Amino acid sequence: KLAEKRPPPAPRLTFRPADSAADVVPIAPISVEVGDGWFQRVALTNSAGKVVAGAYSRDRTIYTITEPLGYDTTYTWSGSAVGHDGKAVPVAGKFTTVAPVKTINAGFQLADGQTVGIAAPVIIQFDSPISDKAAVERALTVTTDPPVEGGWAWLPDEAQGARVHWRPREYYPAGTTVDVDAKLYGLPFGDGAYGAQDMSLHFQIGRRQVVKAEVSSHRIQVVTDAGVIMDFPCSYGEADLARNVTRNGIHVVTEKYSDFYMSNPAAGYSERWAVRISNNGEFIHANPNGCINLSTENAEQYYRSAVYGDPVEVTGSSIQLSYADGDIWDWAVDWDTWVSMSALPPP
């Protein structure tokens, strides 16, 4: 004659990740939901007391974290959720994120905001080898305006570590803007290594400028949208021996010196108005070898015009630019060879 009804349910809390889990990836989904009830308060702190941000998805059945976490850190839940009957039951729990075997840092070779020439590669250099290069490359997106075809390619690791290069197939159209996103935080690089940090880079391609360098011509031409703006007598390597041959193929300008003191394989010299076109010791500069030599006042005027990433098309030479010459050799190989240095299939 009285009640005899079985009570309304207890709230059911489901934790992702679950209580006491270790080796949790710092960008994994982190949540807490309640059925048969709604949350009254939820918070997540790390071991040091820093709240980690999150918001409740509607009809407060779920609370989700909205910022990445750290490595080798233990996180605790605190809160309560009220059931049907009105009594509140605690939201308490723990977990711990991964400590990686090592964290592999990386960096771009250009700065955000840089304006570069129509042949600049995007260079990402790491400070360790990389076991799962495909996993890392799949974390790379390049977005161009206008959109342009290109590819990622891995070069042989340097002493500092592995390194990957992005090249357009044809030259960038002058003015193109470039956005590079590397989502490497919490990404396993394999063999227990993890990305150190997400990286992003914004830069612009500058004015179109192409150097035409036909060795048999004893001239160099500098051509922009204004046409031939420089046609200089010059001279190239005598090509007696191989050390004095100007490499064939499309070079990239990297560095330039008003006034410079160098010593490295060729002999050793100190010069003026040098524009470096290879890490092998080739320059456009003044002579008053390997290099392209101009009069001092023609070397100066070119030197001022030049920009990182400008292409230098050398033709009529008998040794083609190569890995053996150091960076930048990315334009000395056909496209099918470039897509073949991707750690992924070749669409």
What CATH number is given to the structural domain containing 127? 2.60.40.3710
Indicate the number of domains in the chain. 3
Q: Cis peptide leading into 229, omega within 30 of 0?
A: no
| CATH classification of the domain holding 266 | 2.40.440.10
Which residues are known catalytic residues? 285, 291
Of the residues 81, 98, 115, the one at which a domain ends: 98
CA distance 230 to 90: 77
Are residues 68 and 81 both part of a single domain?
yes
**187 & 213 share domain:** no
Instruction: Check residue 240 and give left, alpha or beta (phi > 0: left; psi -120 to 50: alpha).
Output: alpha
Instruction: Tell me if 280 is assigned to a ligand binding site.
Output: yes
Cβ within 8 Å of residue 345, ≥6 positions away: none
Technique behind the model: X-ray
Alpha-carbon distance of 254 to 36, in angstroms, equals: 64
Torsions phi, psi for 304 (to 5 deg):
-70, -35
Is 236 annotated to bind a ligand? Reply is no
Range of the domain at 84: 1-98
The edge-to-edge listing of strands for the beta sheet with 227-233 is 227-233, 219-224, 210-214, 311-315, 249-252
Helix (H, G, I), strand (E, B), or coil: what is residue 133?
helix
**Cα distance between residue 178 and residue 141, in whole Å:** 11
| Same domain for 212 and 313 | yes
Structure tokens at 161: 């570590």
Our CA angle for 280, 282, 288, nearest 5°, is 140
Q: Are residues 113 and 24 in the same domain?
A: no
**Sign of the C-alpha dihedral, residues 148, 124, 331, 268?**
positive
- Resolution of the experimentally solved model in angstroms: 2.6
Q: Which residues in the chain are immediately followed by a break of C to N over 2.5 Å?
A: 270, 288
Secondary structure element (H or E) that encloses residue 302, with its range? helix 296-305
269 in a labelled binding site: yes
Three-class DSSP category at 181: strand
Name the residue among 10, 11, 20 with its Cα closest to residue 61. Answer: 11
Classify residue 210 by its DSSP letter.
E
Between vectors from CA 24 to CA 22 and to CA 29, what angle results, nearest 5°? Answer: 140
CA torsion 103→107→113→116, rounded to 10°?
-160
Nearest 5 degrees, angle CA 84-CA 90-CA 95? Answer: 130
Q: Are residues 200 and 239 in the same domain?
A: no
Known binder of ligand: residue 279? Answer: no
Cα–Cα distance measured from residue 145 to residue 158, given in angstroms and rounded to the nearest whole number = 31
Tell me: do 171 and 64 sit in the same domain. Answer: no
C-alpha 116/C-alpha 211 separation (Å) is 15
Are residues 178 and 228 located together in one domain of the fold?
A: no
Residues 46 and 155 in one domain: no
For 48, the token pair is 């040091």
CA distances from 227 to 187, 212, 249, 312 (A): 48, 12, 22, 16
Domain final position from 45, 74, 98: 98
Q: Indicate if 182 and 230 belong to the same structural domain.
A: no
